[PDB]
Design an enzyme around this catalytic site. Sequence first.
Site, PDB file in Angstrom:
ATOM      1  N   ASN B 429       0.823  -1.202   0.000  1.00  0.00           N
ATOM      2  CA  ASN B 429       0.000   0.000   0.000  1.00  0.00           C
ATOM      3  C   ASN B 429       0.861   1.258   0.000  1.00  0.00           C
ATOM      4  O   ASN B 429       2.076   1.216  -0.203  1.00  0.00           O
ATOM      5  CB  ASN B 429      -0.968   0.014   1.172  1.00  0.00           C
ATOM      6  N   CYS B 431       1.485   3.440   2.564  1.00  0.00           N
ATOM      7  CA  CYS B 431       2.327   3.643   3.730  1.00  0.00           C
ATOM      8  C   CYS B 431       3.223   2.451   4.035  1.00  0.00           C
ATOM      9  O   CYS B 431       3.867   2.441   5.087  1.00  0.00           O
ATOM     10  CB  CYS B 431       1.468   4.000   4.937  1.00  0.00           C
ATOM     11  N   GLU B 433       2.941  -0.949   4.719  1.00  0.00           N
ATOM     12  CA  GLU B 433       2.789  -1.880   5.816  1.00  0.00           C
ATOM     13  C   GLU B 433       1.881  -3.046   5.485  1.00  0.00           C
ATOM     14  O   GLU B 433       1.834  -4.004   6.262  1.00  0.00           O
ATOM     15  CB  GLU B 433       2.245  -1.172   7.066  1.00  0.00           C
TER      16      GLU B 433
HETATM   17  N1  LIG Z   1      -2.012  10.923   3.411  1.00  0.00           N
HETATM   18  C1  LIG Z   1      -2.487   9.676   3.623  1.00  0.00           C
HETATM   19  C2  LIG Z   1      -1.946   8.882   4.618  1.00  0.00           C
HETATM   20  C3  LIG Z   1      -2.444   7.606   4.822  1.00  0.00           C
HETATM   21  N2  LIG Z   1      -3.434   7.145   4.062  1.00  0.00           N
HETATM   22  C4  LIG Z   1      -4.005   5.807   4.232  1.00  0.00           C
HETATM   23  O1  LIG Z   1      -4.182   5.478   5.607  1.00  0.00           O
HETATM   24  C5  LIG Z   1      -3.493   4.270   5.937  1.00  0.00           C
HETATM   25  C6  LIG Z   1      -2.792   4.424   7.275  1.00  0.00           C
HETATM   26  O2  LIG Z   1      -2.289   5.742   7.401  1.00  0.00           O
HETATM   27  P1  LIG Z   1      -2.643   6.569   8.722  1.00  0.00           P
HETATM   28  O3  LIG Z   1      -3.183   5.614   9.753  1.00  0.00           O
HETATM   29  O4  LIG Z   1      -1.470   7.468   9.001  1.00  0.00           O
HETATM   30  O5  LIG Z   1      -3.855   7.490   8.252  1.00  0.00           O
HETATM   31  P2  LIG Z   1      -4.697   8.239   9.383  1.00  0.00           P
HETATM   32  O6  LIG Z   1      -5.592   7.194   9.991  1.00  0.00           O
HETATM   33  O7  LIG Z   1      -3.721   8.803  10.380  1.00  0.00           O
HETATM   34  O8  LIG Z   1      -5.481   9.322   8.694  1.00  0.00           O
HETATM   35  C7  LIG Z   1      -2.501   4.033   4.827  1.00  0.00           C
HETATM   36  O9  LIG Z   1      -2.363   2.643   4.545  1.00  0.00           O
HETATM   37  C8  LIG Z   1      -3.108   4.738   3.648  1.00  0.00           C
HETATM   38  O10 LIG Z   1      -3.915   3.791   2.955  1.00  0.00           O
HETATM   39  C9  LIG Z   1      -3.967   7.969   3.064  1.00  0.00           C
HETATM   40  O11 LIG Z   1      -4.894   7.540   2.356  1.00  0.00           O
HETATM   41  N3  LIG Z   1      -3.489   9.208   2.862  1.00  0.00           N
END
Ligand SMILES: Nc1ccn([C@@H]2O[C@H](COP(=O)(O)OP(=O)(O)O)[C@@H](O)[C@H]2O)c(=O)n1
Lengths: 745, 745
Positions: B429, B431, B433
Site C-alpha cells: 500500500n 504507507c 505496511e
Molecule cells: N495521506 C495519507 C496517509 C495515509 N493514508 C491511508 O491510511 C493508511 C494508514 O495511514 P494513517 O493511519 O497514518 O492514516 P490516518 O488514519 O492517520 O489518517 C494508509 O495505509 C493509507 O492507505 C492515506 O490515504 N493518505
Amino acid sequence: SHMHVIKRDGRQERVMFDKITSRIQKLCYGLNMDFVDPAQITMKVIQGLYSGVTTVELDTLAAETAATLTTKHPDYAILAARIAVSNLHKETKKVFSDVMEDLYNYINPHNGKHSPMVAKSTLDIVLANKDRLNSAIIYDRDFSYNYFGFKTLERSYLLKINGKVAERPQHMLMRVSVGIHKEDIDAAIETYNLLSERWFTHASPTLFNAGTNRPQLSSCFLLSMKDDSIEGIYDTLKQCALISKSAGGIGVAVSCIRATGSYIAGTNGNSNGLVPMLRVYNNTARYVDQGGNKRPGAFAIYLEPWHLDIFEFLDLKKNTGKEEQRARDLFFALWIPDLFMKRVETNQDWSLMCPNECPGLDEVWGEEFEKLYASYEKQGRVRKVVKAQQLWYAIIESQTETGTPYMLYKDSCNRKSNQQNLGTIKCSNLCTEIVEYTSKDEVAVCNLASLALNMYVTSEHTYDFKKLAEVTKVVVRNLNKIIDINYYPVPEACLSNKRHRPIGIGVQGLADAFILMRYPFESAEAQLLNKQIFETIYYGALEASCDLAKEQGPYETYEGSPVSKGILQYDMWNVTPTDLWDWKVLKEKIAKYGIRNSLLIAPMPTASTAQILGNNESIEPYTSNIYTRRVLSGEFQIVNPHLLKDLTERGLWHEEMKNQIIACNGSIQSIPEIPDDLKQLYKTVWEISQKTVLKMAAERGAFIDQSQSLNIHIAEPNYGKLTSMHFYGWKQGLKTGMYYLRTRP
Amino acid sequence: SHMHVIKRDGRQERVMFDKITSRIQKLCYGLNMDFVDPAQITMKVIQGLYSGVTTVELDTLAAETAATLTTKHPDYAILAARIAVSNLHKETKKVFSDVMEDLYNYINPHNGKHSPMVAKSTLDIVLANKDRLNSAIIYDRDFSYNYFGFKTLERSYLLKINGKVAERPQHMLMRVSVGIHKEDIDAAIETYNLLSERWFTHASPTLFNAGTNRPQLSSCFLLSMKDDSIEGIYDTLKQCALISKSAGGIGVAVSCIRATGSYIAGTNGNSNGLVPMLRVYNNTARYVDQGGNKRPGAFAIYLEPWHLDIFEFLDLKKNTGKEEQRARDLFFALWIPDLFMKRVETNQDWSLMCPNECPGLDEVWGEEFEKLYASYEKQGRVRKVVKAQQLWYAIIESQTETGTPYMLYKDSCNRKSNQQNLGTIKCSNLCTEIVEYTSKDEVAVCNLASLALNMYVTSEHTYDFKKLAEVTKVVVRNLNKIIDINYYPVPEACLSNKRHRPIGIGVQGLADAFILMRYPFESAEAQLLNKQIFETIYYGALEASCDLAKEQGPYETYEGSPVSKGILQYDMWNVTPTDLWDWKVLKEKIAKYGIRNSLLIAPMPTASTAQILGNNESIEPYTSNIYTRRVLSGEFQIVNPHLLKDLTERGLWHEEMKNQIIACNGSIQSIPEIPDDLKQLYKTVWEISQKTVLKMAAERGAFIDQSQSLNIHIAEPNYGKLTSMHFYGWKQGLKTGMYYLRTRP
Ligand SMILES: Nc1ccn([C@@H]2O[C@H](COP(=O)(O)OP(=O)(O)O)[C@@H](O)[C@H]2O)c(=O)n1
Ligand SMILES: Nc1ncnc2c1ncn2[C@H]1C[C@H](O)[C@@H](COP(=O)(O)OP(=O)(O)OP(=O)(O)O)O1
Ligand SMILES: Nc1ncnc2c1ncn2[C@H]1C[C@H](O)[C@@H](COP(=O)(O)OP(=O)(O)OP(=O)(O)O)O1
Ligand SMILES: Nc1ncnc2c1ncn2[C@H]1C[C@H](O)[C@@H](COP(=O)(O)OP(=O)(O)OP(=O)(O)O)O1
Ligand SMILES: Nc1ncnc2c1ncn2[C@H]1C[C@H](O)[C@@H](COP(=O)(O)OP(=O)(O)OP(=O)(O)O)O1
Ligand SMILES: Nc1ccn([C@@H]2O[C@H](COP(=O)(O)OP(=O)(O)O)[C@@H](O)[C@H]2O)c(=O)n1
Ligand SMILES: [Mg+2]
Ligand SMILES: [Mg+2]
Ligand SMILES: [Mg+2]
Ligand SMILES: [Mg+2]
C-alpha cells in the site's frame, strides 16, 4: 583506404563524379535546358559528400539541392520530383503482389511474431485477383506529385518495414482500393484510376488503415458524457483513450458537469469544477497518440456559455499563469445559443448557473431554451449574474491572445440539420465541420472524402460541371462501402454509424479553381461560381444517395426527417437554388425512394491532404503569394507557381522579382511592374475584406447540410472588426463563427 | 449604536467584560491557581474584540489565547481543552437520538433532496435501542483530549451541517460503535467504553464512514494492472478513481508496462514508456480527493528495478527540470529483489530489460528469479547494461534529494508471508505496511485498527500484559465484524476481501510507553520490552482469530498456508520466542481449528490518529523534545510534557529553561542542568544511532506477519550511513528498507 562509397547493392567503389551528372541529365529529359544545370547540383552535392556514404543519401541530397535551387527556374521542382520518385522506384519492388506477401509475412525482428501489416482477407483478395490488378496499375503517375508533397507522403504515410519504406505510392493507392472495394474489381479499377488521377482523395485514417489488420477508416468522432459522476467521467475518458488510439478525432460535449462549489451527496463535499478534470484530459491528450505516433491525439472541449466555470474555462489555454491552472494541449470551443448573442447585443445581464441546480438544459434549443432559461432566470436559482459584454470582452481577449475558443452557434446548428427528429445536437468534431447527434448510447462517427477542384478545370477556362457530379457519385459509393467494412473501436460507435449512417464530402483548393478559371476572388463570377459548384456537388450527392436507397432501402430512422417532409437544406436557408439543374425530378425520386445517408456534405480543413496534392487549404485564399518551404538547412521562399506561370508569360518576371516581393510579404500590388489584373486574380487574404468571404460562406454553407471550417485572417487586433464580424456571421446565419483568429506578425 | 455583541441565542448586548472572567474562573476548577490567571487571557481576548462579534468567536479566541499561554504553566492546556470542549458542549444537542434524526432528516438547502448523513438501518438500530444507548454514553470523557487533538478532530472528522458542526465527540464514537456492531448492543457498549476510554482507535475512513450512507470503512488498497494495453491502463485508472473517491489509499504495481521504444503490433509504432502514463496518474492524483476533500488522494507507484525506464522513473519526483517530465504529486517506490542487492554489493553489472521482450518476470521471486533473470541475461535479449553501483548512486541521489523512492525487498516479503500459496506478492500500500497478494481478479483490501500503548502502563511502572491481549481480542472481533458490513467500491474488492479476509492492527506511541515505563530507548529493557509486547499482541491476535475460526470456520483458502503447516511468522525469522507465554496449546488449537484471518499485524504510521490522541507517531522516538504548534498568528514551541513533568518535580525547571532548549533543538543533553538520566530517557532521535533502531525493527518485525513503516532520520547527507544502513537492513532481514529519508535543516 580511399574514399569509397557504399553502392546500393551493398558494395563499395571509388568516388567517380561523372556518375552523378551521368544520372541527372538522364533524369532531365523534357525540361528547359537554358536553365537546367546539372553542374550546380553536382557541386553542392559534392560539398556534402565524404568517405563511406550510402548512395541513397546522395540521391536524397541531390533532390534536396534541386529543391533549394527551384527558385532560379520552376523546372527544378519537376527535376527534384523526378529525383526523389526515381530514387524510390529504383529501390522497392515492381510487383504489388509480392509486396503484399512481404507485408503479411512480416516477422517482428526480435519477437518472432507473425505480426502482419495487412489482414489475411486483403491478401486473399489480392492473390485471387493479382493478374488483372497488377496489370491495372500505372507507374507513370508517380512522377506527378510535388516534391514537398512527396516527402510529406513518404515520411508518415507509406507503410515502413524496420525503418525502410517498402511501398511505392501506387502500391498504397491500390492497397486502399483493395481495402475498400473488397469483392468487386471493376470498382477497384475505376476507383483506382479516378483516385490516382488525383481527382479525389480519402481522409488520412483511410490512408493509414485501409485493408490493414485493424481497419479503422473513420476520422470523425463526437462524444458526450455518459454521466455527471466519476463513473461517467472516467468511462468517457476510457472511450476517448481507445478512439484516440485508433487514430480518430474527438470532440467532447462537457456541458453537463456540475460547477465549482456544488454539493456532492455521496461524500458530503463540494466539487472543484472543471479545471482539474480538463487537466486530466490534458495529460490524456499528451499520452495517447493517434496511430503509430503519426500525429498527436487532440481533443476538442465544447462548453455552452451559461455554465458557471466559464471564466476559468476561457483563461485555460494561455501561456502565462500557474501551470496547474492551464490545459494548453487541448482545443477549446464555445457552443453559443442566441441568448448570449442578444444579451451582448443590448448590454443586458447574463445568468451563470450550475447544471446540478438547473438540470436538463443543454438538450433544449431555440425559443424553448429562451423559455426555460428565462424561467430559471426568474426563480433566483442562478448563482452568478455577469454583464454580458464583460464575458464578450473575455472571449475577445482569449481569441485575441491564442485564437481559441472556437465559436459555434447552437440554435443555428440545431435548426438547420437533418437530424432534428433525434433530439438536440450537443457538440461537433475537432475541426468543426461535423454537426451530428450524440447521446449516452450513440457516439457519433463520420467518414470523410476530400475532392480536389482544379483537376476539373478544362482548357477553355469554362468549368466542368457534369464530371463533378459523376465523380461525386463514385465518392458516395466509396464511403457507403466504407461504413460497412470499418471496425469501430468502441461498441457505441457501431450502433450510431449503422442506424443513422452519415458520410462526409469536402473539397480542397478553391483558390486554384478560381485562378484556373481566371476570376478575381471577390468578383461576381466567383460568388456565382462556388454557388453553382456546391449546387452540383449537393445535387450529385443527393442523386447518388437516392440511387443507393433505390437498391438497399433508406436508413433506419428516415421517416421523420425533413427530407422525408420534402424540405432540403436550401429551404432551411430559404434560398431558392439557381436554374442550373432540375430539382423537381430529384425531389420526386427522393419522395419515392428516400436517401441512404442522412448528412452528406462537410468541408473539412485538409491540412495534410492538400499538403500532398499541392492544392491550397480547402476554401480560403492564399495566405501570401510567397510561401516558405521547410528544407533541412534551407527554410526559404517559393512564390505561388500560378502567379509565376503568368509572370513568365507576361514578361514582367525577371531575376529579382522574388526580392521585390520579399519586402511586401506576398503583396504583389505594391510593385510598379503590374498589369493591374494580377491584383485581382492574386489577392492576398490579408488584403481581402473578410465580410465578402463571409457572404460567400453564407451562400456556400447555405448549400451544405453540415458546417464548414472558417479560418479568419485579421492582421491586427481590433475589437470592431471582430465583434461586427461575429455578429455579421450570426446575421448571415452561419453555423460556425470562427475556427481560428490568425494574426500575422 | 454602541458596541453590541451577538449573544449565542441570536440577540445583542452591551460589552460587559466581567462575563469573561465570570466564565473562565468557573472553568478553572481543579488547577494550580498560583499560575492560572484569567486576567491575562481576558486582556488578550479584549485586544481582539470589536463591535458586532458572535460570542463563539470570543470563546474560540479564548481557548486560542490559553493555548498560546500554555508555555508559562502546563495547566493552560487543560484550561484550553476545557474552554473549547465546553464551547462545543454548550452548543449542540444533549441526546444522541435526536442528533441522528436530524442527520437522517437532512435536506439539501437549495435542492430539497432528503440527502441523509446516515443510512436508514443505522437510524433503525438507534431508534430501536435509544433507551439503553443514551444511558450508556458518558460525556465526562470529552474533557480528556488535548487541545490540538480536539481542533484536529473538529476541523475534519465531526459531521457538519451547512458548515456548523453538529456532533459532540461521544456522538461520533457512539455513532461508530452503532456503525460496526449492528444488531448487538453489549458489543457496542464494551466497544464504546473501551473505545472512548482511549485504549484503541480505528482508522480514519472508519471514522469517516461508520454507519453513513456509503459505508466504506477500509483504508488499504493494493491494485495491479489488468493488462499491458490501453484497456488495462485506463480500466485501472477507473478503479483508482473510484477507490480514491471512497477515501482509500492506493498502491499500484506498475511493473508490467512495456518500456520506451518497444514495438506496438497494433498501430506499428513505438511506446513512449512510463513517463507520460505516470503523468496521467499525476493529474488523477490531483483531481480526485479522498472523501469530501478531507485529504488529497495519493497514489503509490511500485516499480521493480530491472525495468528499462528506471532512470526517468527515479528522476521523476524532483523540483527542477521541465514540467512535462515530472510527476511530483505521487509517491514512488522500488520493489527490489536480492539480485540488485548482490550486484551493488560486488560492483558487477545489471541488465535493464523490457517486459514485452522478457515476459512473466515479476511473478517470480527468489532463486527462481535468479535463474530466469540469468537465463534472459544469457541470451542477449536485454536492452541496456548498467553498472549496478551507478544505479545505486542514482537511488541515493533521489532519496537524498526528496526521500522518495521507498525501498522494499521483494524476496524478503515473498518469503516471509502467509499468502505464499497464492503466488507472488507484487506490491504494497501507500504507507508500506500491508503486504498482500494482488492479481487481475483480486484487488487487495485491508482494514486497520491502531492500539495505543501508554494507556496500558500501570502506576507500578510495570507494564500490563494481560489487558493488552484482551483488548486485542475485542479489536479482532471488531475488524472481523467490519469486513462483512463494508461496501466495496469496485466488484473485484469483495471477492478478495471475502476469500482471504485480512485485518490490520497497528500500535501508536511507543516512546510514551518507554517514558512511562521509565527506560532508555537504547537500553536492554526496551529491546526486551517491545519484543514482549508484540509477543503479547501477536499471541492475543492468534488466540482471537482461533476463537473466531472455532465458531465460523476458517477462511476459504486456509489449507495450504504455512500456518496450516504449523510454521508461524517467528519461525520464518528462525527466532524462538520468549517463555512469556504458552505457544504449544495455541498451536494445538490452531492445528485443530485454524484461524479466521490470514494476515493480522500491521504497524501503520498514524499521523492523524496520533495527532488526535496526543501520542507520538507509531514506533519512532520523538523528533525533538521541543515540538512546534500551529496556532493562528502564533506558531510556537511546546516542550515534551513528560519531560516537563519530570522537570517540575526534579526542580531544575525554571522560567528560562525553554529558552535554554531553543538553541539546541530538543537536545537537552547539552545543558549543564542535567541529572544524567534524562539524557537516556529523552534521547532525541537525531542523537540516536539508527542501527540500534534497525535491530529493534528486526526483533519487532520478526514478530509481525506484515511489514512496518520505518521513518529514517539522518541529519546530514552521507553515503556511508545510507548504504551501510540499507545493506544492514537487508542483512537483518527487514521487509522495508526505508519509508522516508528525513534530514533536518
Ligand atoms: N495521506 C495519507 C496517509 C495515509 N493514508 C491511508 O491510511 C493508511 C494508514 O495511514 P494513517 O493511519 O497514518 O492514516 P490516518 O488514519 O492517520 O489518517 C494508509 O495505509 C493509507 O492507505 C492515506 O490515504 N493518505
Ligand atoms: N562511385 C560513386 N561515387 C560517388 N557517388 C556515386 C558513385 N556512384 C553513384 N554515385 C551517386 C550518383 C547518384 O547521385 C547516387 C546514386 O547512384 P546509383 O547509381 O543510383 O546507385 P547504384 O549504382 O546501385 O544504382 P544502379 O546500380 O541501378 O545504377 O550516388
Ligand atoms: N471526491 C471528489 N473530488 C472531486 N470531485 C468529485 C468527487 N466526487 C465526486 N466528484 C464530482 C464528480 C462529479 O462531477 C460530481 C458527482 O459525482 P457523483 O458520483 O455523481 O456524486 P454522487 O452520486 O456520489 O453524489 P450526487 O448524488 O450529488 O451526484 O462530483
Ligand atoms: N454581554 C457580553 N458582552 C461581551 N462578551 C460577552 C457577553 N456575554 C458573554 N460574553 C462572552 C463570555 C464568553 O467568553 C462568551 C460566551 O458567553 P455565553 O454566556 O456562553 O453566551 P450565552 O450567554 O448565550 O450562553 P448561556 O446563555 O448558556 O449563558 O462571550
Ligand atoms: N497510441 C499510443 N500512444 C502511446 N502509447 C501507446 C499507444 N497505443 C498503445 N500504446 C502503448 C500502451 C501500452 O503500454 C502498449 C500496448 O498497448 P496495446 O493495446 O496492448 O497495443 P496493441 O494490442 O494494439 O499491440 P500489441 O499487441 O503489441 O500490444 O503500447
Ligand atoms: N491535427 C488533427 C487535425 C484533424 N484531425 C481529424 O481529421 C479530420 C479532418 O482534418 P484533416 O482532413 O485536415 O486531417 P488530414 O486528413 O489532413 O490529416 C478532423 O475532423 C479531425 O477529426 C485530427 O485527428 N488531428
Ligand atoms: Mg549506378
Ligand atoms: Mg451522482
Ligand atoms: Mg451567558
Ligand atoms: Mg496488445
